[PDB]
Amino acid sequence: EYYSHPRLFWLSQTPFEQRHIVDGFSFELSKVVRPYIRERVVDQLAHIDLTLAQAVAKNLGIELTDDQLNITPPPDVNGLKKDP
Amino acid sequence: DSLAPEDGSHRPAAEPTPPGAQPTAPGSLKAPDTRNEKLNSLEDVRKGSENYALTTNQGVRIADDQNSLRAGSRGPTLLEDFILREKITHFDHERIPERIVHARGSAAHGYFQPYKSLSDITKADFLSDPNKITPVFVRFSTVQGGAGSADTVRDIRGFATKFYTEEGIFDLVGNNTPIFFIQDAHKFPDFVHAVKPEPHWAIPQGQSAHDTFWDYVSLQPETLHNVMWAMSDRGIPRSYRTMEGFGIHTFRLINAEGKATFVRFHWKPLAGKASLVWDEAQKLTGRDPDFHRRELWEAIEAGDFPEYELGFQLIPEEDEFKFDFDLLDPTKLIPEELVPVQRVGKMVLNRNPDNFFAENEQAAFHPGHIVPGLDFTNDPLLQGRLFSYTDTQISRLGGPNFHEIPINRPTCPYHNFQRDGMHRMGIDTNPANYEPNSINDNWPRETPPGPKRGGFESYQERVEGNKVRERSPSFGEYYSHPRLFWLSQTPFEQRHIVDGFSFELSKVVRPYIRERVVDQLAHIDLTLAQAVAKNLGIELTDDQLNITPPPDVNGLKKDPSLSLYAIPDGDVKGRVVAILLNDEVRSADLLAILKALKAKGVHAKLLYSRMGEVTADDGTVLPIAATFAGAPSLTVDAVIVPCGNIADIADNGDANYYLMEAYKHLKPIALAGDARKFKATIKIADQGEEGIVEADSADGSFMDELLTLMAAHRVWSRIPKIDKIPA
Amino acid sequence: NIADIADNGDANYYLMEAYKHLKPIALAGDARKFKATIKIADQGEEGIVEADSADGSFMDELLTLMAAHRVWSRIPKIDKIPA
Amino acid sequence: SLQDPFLNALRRERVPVSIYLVNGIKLQGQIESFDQFVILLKNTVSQMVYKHAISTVVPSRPV
Amino acid sequence: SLQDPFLNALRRERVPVSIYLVNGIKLQGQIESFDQFVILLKNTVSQMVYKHAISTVVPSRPV
Amino acid sequence: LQDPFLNALRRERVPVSIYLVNGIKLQGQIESFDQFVILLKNTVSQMVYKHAISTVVPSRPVS
Amino acid sequence: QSLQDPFLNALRRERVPVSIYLVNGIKLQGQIESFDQFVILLKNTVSQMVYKHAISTVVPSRP
Ligand code: HEM
After folding, report:
1. Phi, psi of B295 (to 5 degrees)
2. Are B643 and B617 in contact (CB under 8 A)?
3. Per the database record, which ranges form the Sm domain (chain G)?
């Protein structure tokens, strides 16, 4: 299982903390030269949270597809919606 | 279903291509056609990878490389997992000692050839025939910082060339200044400890701006000449391609009759001289600390081979004493006004290595690797160096057999009676391991010295004196060379020197050291000491103000060869320009921009607020290489902002600051059409200003004004205007 | 003597960088004229402590901003500043 | 004379060339002008090259 | 012919030049005057350069 | 003598070794000549000056 | 407009020490004893004769 922990992490973060995460990925990803890698990392992000993948994909100039937009988020972790 | 992209965009073109165009790649895959005898001799130890099975080092194919062998899908790891143990073990022992100094360094392959036979003055086989091509390996470097320190630090640069000649390896191990810090190798470690991080806490990294270094300087004025160079823009080059290189010591050339001629070696950059400015250099260590290593790598992939011209200062034996400093003192330069540099040949650096550890990290340069035709002098710093570069290999590269490491392997024959190191590769078949030996008819044999292909024999210099530990009195002059240096520099160059000292000195915590360094500066030039002392808040005393300047050097009041920018020889081929995009670039602007630049070999990188693409006004699709923040003005030589939807970027913090930083660092800026509204941020007048190219659109005229600013490297005239801008 | 530093590139940028990185800034008396560079309003702004002089109140507002570490509320306003 | 028909070609064709000097240096650019004694070689600037110091002219493509 | 206007402008404009000789030495300075056969290059002293020995004359910037 | 000898190499289209003053050895076939220059062919056609040539050596004998 | 004759005459007349760099890079020192169209007599400790076609540059040891 790969996604529910990232998700937990992400939803525990304050809004400004999440901008930072977004900008973190966008910055790093932008120095990956081979763009197919950028896409594949975005694809992973789609499985964690769609807000997140949208923001990053915007910043890299990527359109999430219909497929990607519909990806079911992973389960809560033991019924948790956040951990402060 | 394999993991490479379907369209093949994982794999770079085997073609000269610009910085950013392609992923970078090992020389043998990016430039397979480039060859030379060294690079082909390496073939036996290269390893490919495609269409091969993953295996243990012992040859066993691996089936699962994703798991330890455990008792159960959730049990302990077992000691019988030899695949895991080998894989981890090798990883565990990956690292070898970094260099004591010049640990941080960047290399490439290439070749050299002489312009004409030099047999008049030396029997050095590699200089015997202009048709003789000699493969080289060159490593440029900093001095102080560790192997993982920054590239653009204010330090000396090293410049080491290994010549793989037909009569042995010749190592030319030089720096980017023509003198050294110290006079006798016995104080080598003292100085190096003084500039290296402080021992209690390991601070600062690749910087001289600390207490101990200046403490030392202040107590050993022998250092001042080279410290001058360091503080100048010389100590923060633009590119390894854009600095001069020096052998420093006087050596000897020896010809077929045994005539000795003194010589000092030079590398002269066909790219010309160019250096950054401090704020730019310092902040660039943060924005891209691999800046030099990168620029070198890319320049080479891009076809912009770094070229340097090997030149000699030659001084006849009977001139030893004509100069009013000592030729053997390594803290003195030979002014080119008194001895000019004669270009002798040329070196081209035309291919990157395949593996950085294999080839760079393990290479061993040593100045005492000379050949017949060359010899040493009594320079007491050189004398020292001879000892150290052999010794240190024993622990850096693990033993006496370091010459067997592929990159270090000679390309001519090598045979002797030396047996048995650690990690011995060669398997000697000689029935004998000693000479004289009758059992193998004394092979291999001594070779009497001769015109070419002879034994090495030292020049039979007369030695007369007692066994003493004493500095030559003739070395006792410290100031006239600094003075010479300083008066050769342009006014803006001197501001930089001043600000150099002021900055460094300001991070010396113990103020009495600041005073003592100022006192030294007083003995070199009073202008200089005043400016620095002002900036540190020090009043020179009456005593200090009256200090007599040192003599001219052999009647010289300046030497233009010591300035970077006296006579600009700045060259645009290989340089890079930032193009600031908006979502609606006026295509015929851009067409003309890239077309002009391309004609003079100048690279562009198209930048935006985000990655991906934007579209031109005519619907040409413009791929973005990095964002404004991703590739700061630091990394480029100029900034161009074409017309279009200026509204898109007009209020963008990052695009504005791109320009403000660029302006503060004296870079050319070119604004077309509505882009001229950016003049507002750079607090420029509406009248215009020199260094800001502006027009309704980018045309013949617009581009030429810009490229011409670039041939001047920087806009020095801007200096007075930049203190008001807050960047 | 604010006049001393008022037009100094480095002192201004010190403030601009500090502001872009969401740090607390405190300006007494004529130092308030630096608000101009940070493109701050005359009304005030949260995260910029300001007053005729440094007193009990001035210092406490500042130290309290510090207990919050950074001025997160500033984020929306920083993209216009060019630092 | 064969010098000039050839030099003229290279000039009007703005072909890039490699001038090899007797001293063994290599020069590069585009031929801007020439007479009985010099060649002007265009790059960033123009440079005057003495034909007495030139050993060989090589074009970057046949003309 | 060409030498003359080229040299003349360098001088008149006081623009720094480099002069690469056949012996592999590179002289620098400002062109003071010339001749059928020589050039005077100003630095600390003026010095006399025999044209037969010059291979290229290289301006530091456009004229 | 220069023209009997050159024409013979040109007409027979024989490989020649041209050594220069610096010591460099060039190779190929002589396509045409002039009072001042020679055109040597192999990969590209290049223009050598006679003042820079030291010796022309035929790869094989002519009349 | 000859310059090389006034220049060389001035040097000898004032008996001022000079450096003469030859075409192979070699430095000669002395005072000019007298000269020709074709040679210079350089008085050092011995009077020696230097061919002008072999001289690159002539350098006064003062203005
Ligand atoms: C003359 C001034 C000097 C110059 C131009 C100079 C040049 C250098 C350069 C460029 C390197 C980096 C070599 C590389 O890329 O592998 C270096 C490394 C080294 N130098 Fe210095 N150096 C100087 C003074 C000294 C002195 C005085 C000593 C000791 C007395 C010393 C001992 C070393 C050692 C032991 C290494 C590196 C370890 C190794 O490569 O085996 N050098 N030298």
Report:
1. -65, -40
2. no
3. 5-63
- CB-based contacts of B582, cutoff 8 Å, min separation 6: B608, B614, B644, B645, B646, B647, B648, B649
Structural domains in chain B, sorted by start: 25-410 (2.40.180.10), 470-573 (1.20.1370.20), 574-727 (3.40.50.880)
- Nearest-by-Cβ selection for E23 from G2, G3, G25: G25
Which of B175, B176, B360, B408 is the catalytic position? B175
Return the ∠ at Cα B207 (arms to B205 and B209), rounded to 5°: 130
| Residue F24, amino acid | I
Distance CA F32, CA F39 (A): 5
The CB-side HSE value for B724 (13 A sphere, CA atoms) comes to 7
User: Which CATH number characterizes residue D46's domain?
Assistant: 2.30.30.100
Q: Which residues contact A49 (CB under 8 A, 6 or more apart)?
A: A6, A7, A10, A11, A73
Under 8 Å CB-to-CB from B650, ≥6 apart: which residues?
B677, B678
Tell me, what DSSP letter sits at residue B139?
A: E
CB G7 within 8 A of CB G45: no
How many angstroms is it from G50 CA to the middle of ligand 1?
45
What residues make up the domain containing E42? 1-63
Resolution (A): 2.8
State the method.
Answer: X-ray
Distance of alpha carbon B572 from alpha carbon B480, whole angstroms: 35
Is E55 in Cβ contact with D45 (below 8 Å)? no
Q: Are B593 and B625 in contact (CB under 8 A)?
A: no
The radius of gyration of chain F from alpha carbons, rounded to an integer in Å, stands at 11
Q: What's the number of domains chain G is made of? A: 1
Decide if A48 contacts A3 (C-beta within 8 A). yes
Taking the C-alpha atoms of residue B198 and residue B187, their distance in angstroms, rounded to an integer, is 17
Please report, to the nearest 10 degrees, the dihedral formed by the alpha carbons of residues B147, B151, B155, B158 taken in order.
70
Is B102 part of the annotated catalytic residue set?
Answer: yes
Residue E40 has its nearest CB partner, among G3, G22, G55, at G3
B201 alpha carbon – ligand 1 mean position (Å) = 25
Q: How many CA atoms lie within 13 A of G51 on its CB side?
A: 6
What gap in Å lies between CA D57 and CA D11, rounded to an integer?
A: 13
Whether residue B100 has its Cβ less than 6 Å from ligand 1? yes
| B356 in Cβ contact with B109 (< 8 Å) | no
Is residue B193 part of the annotated active site? The answer reads no
**Alpha-carbon radius of gyration of chain B:** 28
Residues 6+ apart with CB under 8 A from B89: none
| Token pair 């040329």: residue | B346
The beta strands (E) that lie in B540-683 are given as 576-580, 603-608, 612-615, 621-624, 626-627, 638-641, 669-672
Q: What whole-number distance in Å separates Cα of residue B597 and Cα of residue B338?
A: 40
Give how far B131 is from chain F: nearest CA, Å.
6
Interface check G63 vs B, CB under 8 A:
no
Assess whether the C-beta atom of B550 lies below 6 angstroms from ligand 1: no
Do the Cβ atoms of B140 and B157 come closer than 8 Å? yes
Is there a binding annotation on residue B389? yes
Structure tokens at B556: 């010289």
CA B518 to ligand 1 center in whole angstroms: 30
Neighbours of chain G (3+ CB pairs under 8 A): B, E
Q: What is the number of H-type helices and E-type strands within chain E?
A: 1, 5
**DSSP, res B438:** T
B392 lines ligand 1 (CB under 6 A): yes
Asked if D45's CB is within 8 angstroms of E58's CB, the reply is yes
Strand, helix or coil at B106? strand
Q: What is the DSSP secondary structure assignment for residue B97, as one 8-state letter?
A: P
Contact B141 CB / ligand 1 (< 6 Å) = yes
